[PDB]
């Protein structure tokens, strides 16, 4: 059997390093008007505006490429004891495939 520490080591989410400026492919799984909801793996999904150039091959199931500025997007504010999460990661949609 393979231990969870070995699993975590030979997991791609750990071999990625920090999410910043890492090119990751993902799928579109939900659309609202022009707000594409893309998964890139990991815990959360990202939301990206539909690019107006070539804006019709961005449908449910499309493979896109993402830059992944952030992985969870949390921040603590002035009076808070825990931080305010938005349950969503940050990424920039660069194209298809």
């Amino acid at each position: 059997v393979e231990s969870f520490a070995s699993m975590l080591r030979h997991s791609p989410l750990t071999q990625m390093g920090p999410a910043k400026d890492k090119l990751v492919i993902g799928r579109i799984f939900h659309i609202v008007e022009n707000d594409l909801y893309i998964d890139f793996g990991g815990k959360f999904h990202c939301v990206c505006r539909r690019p107006e150039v070539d804006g019709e091959k961005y449908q449910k199931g499309t493979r896109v490429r993402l830059r992944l500025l952030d992985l969870e997007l949390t921040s603590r504010f002035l009076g808070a004891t825990t931080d305010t999460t938005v349950l969503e990661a940050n990424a920039v949609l660069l194209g298809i495939q």
Binding site: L8, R9, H10, P12, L13, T14, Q15, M16, G17, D21, K22, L23, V24, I25, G26, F40, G41, G42, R65, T81
Partner: protein, 126 residues
């Protein structure tokens, strides 16, 4: 009857104590199942508190020798155009090729870091 005091103890403790007293005449459906297979921690209410002085979280941080040489790799040679997939298991990145072949150089046996980096760099170029 029952006791709606969620904070004094657990539901198991309150129910066992009431049926021992003789107030809750019929045992609830969950009592014998709990008595057969209790969880690892008794669900007793606890007030969360702030750590104030010299108290730190015992949660450690995850790091590796592979993470060191990944640091050096992403330092000198940027994240390549070969994008990460991150969905399929056993996905091996270009940096993953770098670390595994750095590792085979390490175990074949040698001394110095800069020269490690150079023969693995020419080996990637090959």
């Amino acid at each position: 009857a029952g006791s709606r005091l969620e904070t004094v103890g657990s539901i198991f403790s309150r129910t066992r104590d009431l049926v021992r007293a003789g107030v809750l005449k019929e045992k609830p459906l969950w009592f014998d199942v709990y008595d057969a297979f209790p969880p690892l921690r008794e669900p007793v209410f606890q007030r969360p508190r702030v750590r104030y002085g010299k108290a730190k979280a015992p949660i450690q941080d995850i790091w590796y020798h592979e993470d060191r040489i990944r640091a050096k790799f992403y330092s000198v040679y940027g994240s390549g155009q070969r994008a990460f997939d991150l969905f399929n298991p056993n996905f091996k990145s270009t940096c993953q090729r770098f670390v595994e072949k750095y590792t085979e150089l390490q175990k074949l046996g040698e001394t110095d870091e800069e020269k490690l980096f150079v023969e693995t760099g020419k080996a990637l170029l090959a």
